């Protein structure tokens, strides 16, 4: 029913990486024939491994499958830096494929960049409809990894925003952008608005007070 | 060539249905199993289902045999599914893949579908309120909110910032989808040479162009 594998890996190129699935049914077995298959920008499939350690012809050789202990396993060696991407395993189960959850692998394939922030208040025409939007974009980070926080007078917001999964930029960074929406009431009843972006540890604060 | 090229998906009204359509081309259809596979706007894949060759076995993921009826047609090589009830949940870019007997010795999932997007909505064409986002370099942008269906497309001084831009994903929220765009720019032309996005909406046949002005 349930096939697990890490949410998420980072190794750097030339390093040896290896990607597990593990199911909830009891112990992976040939007989569940597990296959990889990898998920790169603007949904891009393609499959890696079939039954269980079988490389489909034209993937590059550093790919295998196997199995290692009750799991089986998907093993980069040399990893380079375009395998940076989402890669799902599947377990059949005589009459059914279940995929597990996917492993989104980060390779260091590029020196470490903190997030660019800019918290815009919202806009005039907008209040005017009695909304009020604080738009957080975060740009030109590496890895593409962030969290996102909003203080509205210092209390941590959990609903009534949307945050965008990282997206790869031209520069082969990551970008993300963050919104706040506010009835025009919430946006007048508070005075100190701030978007905070955690990257590897640090956190970086934009904020504004209306 | 193998191409996957998929058809059929859209908008649908909860409890309503759909056929999508999977149409193979440069390689014999008749020898391989096909699947259906979806992949929900966060969330990661689902399997769906697969169809024998020769359609006498059909396999479903069992909690949704009663939703999805796969089928196939070898004398037009395209792999059909049929969608029923559809609530919410079900919206999703469905992919159709070829489940490729390598050697007579294993499957693999190799060549996928582009994906076509289903969208299970009761909301009706909106139009997006594109509003201006502004305060050594500078960084502005266009809030482009609250329309219904995607996509929508966006460009600076009518596709010639090209640098310095960023269109980020919409968001959802409330049925009706939301995206920015920024661009950075020298704090010289701003003020200055004047920086106006321009969005299109197709499905309400809209286009807005807006200018950037300091507050
Ligand atoms: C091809 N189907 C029938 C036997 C195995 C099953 C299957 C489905 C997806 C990937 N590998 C195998």
């Known amino acids: 029913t349930v096939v697990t594998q890490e949410s998420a890996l980072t190794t750097s190129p030339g390093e040896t990486v290896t990607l597990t699935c593990r199911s909830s049914?009891?112990?992976?077995?040939?007989?569940?024939?597990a296959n990889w298959v990898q998920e790169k920008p603007d949904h891009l499939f393609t499959g890696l491994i079939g039954?269980?350690?079988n490389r489909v012809p034209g993937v590059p050789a550093r790919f295998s499958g196997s199995l290692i202990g009750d799991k089986a396993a998907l093993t980069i060696t040399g990893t380079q830096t375009e395998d940076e991407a989402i890669y799902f395993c599947?377990?059949?189960?005589?009459?059914?494929?279940?995929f597990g959850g996917g492993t989104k692998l980060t390779v260091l394939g590029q020196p470490k960049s903190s997030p660019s922030v800019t918290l815009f208040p919202p806009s005039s025409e907008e209040l005017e409809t009695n909304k009020a939007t604080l738009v957080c974009t975060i740009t030109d980070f590496y890895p593409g990894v962030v969290t996102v926080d909003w203080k509205v007078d210092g209390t941590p917001v959990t609903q009534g925003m949307e945050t965008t999964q990282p997206s790869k930029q031209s520069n082969n960074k990551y970008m993300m952008s963050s919104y706040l929406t506010l009835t025009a009431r919430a946006w007048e009843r508070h005075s100190s608005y701030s978007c905070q972006v955690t990257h590897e540890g640090h956190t970086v604060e934009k904020s504004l007070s209306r | 060539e193998v191409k996957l090229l998929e058809s059929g998906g859209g908008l649908v009204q909860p409890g309503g249905s759909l056929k999508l359509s999977c149409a193979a081309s440069?390689?014999?259809?008749?020898?391989?199993?096909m699947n259906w596979v979806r992949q929900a706007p966060g969330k990661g894949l689902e399997w769906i289902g697969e169809?024998?060759?020769?359609?006498?076995?059909?396999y479903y993921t069992p909690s949704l045999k009663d939703k999805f009826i796969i089928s196939r047609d070898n004398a037009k090589n395209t792999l059909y599914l049929q969608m029923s009830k559809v609530r919410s949940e079900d919206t999703a870019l469905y992919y159709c893949?070829?489940?490729?007997?390598?050697?007579?010795?294993?499957?693999?999932?190799?060549?996928w579908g582009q994906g076509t997007s289903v969208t299970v909505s009761a909301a009706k064409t909106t139009p997006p309120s594109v509003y201006p986002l502004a305060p050594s370099m500078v960084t502005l942008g266009c809030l482009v909110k609250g329309y219904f269906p995607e996509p929508v497309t966006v460009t600076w001084n009518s596709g010639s910032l090209s640098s310095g831009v960023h269109t980020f994903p919409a968001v959802l929220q409330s049925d009706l989808y939301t995206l920015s765009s920024s661009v950075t720019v020298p704090s010289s032309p701003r003020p200055s040479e004047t920086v106006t996005c321009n969005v299109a909406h197709p499905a309400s046949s809209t286009k807005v162009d807006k200018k950037i002005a300091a507050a």
């Open positions: 599947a377990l059949w189960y005589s009459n059914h494929l279940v």
């Open positions: 169809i024998n060759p020769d359609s006498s076995t059909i």
């Open positions: 893949a070829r489940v490729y007997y390598y050697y007579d010795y294993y499957y693999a999932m190799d060549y």
């Open positions: 039954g269980t350690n």
């Open positions: 049914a009891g112990a992976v077995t040939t007989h569940n024939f």
């Open positions: 440069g390689f014999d259809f008749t020898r391989c199993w």
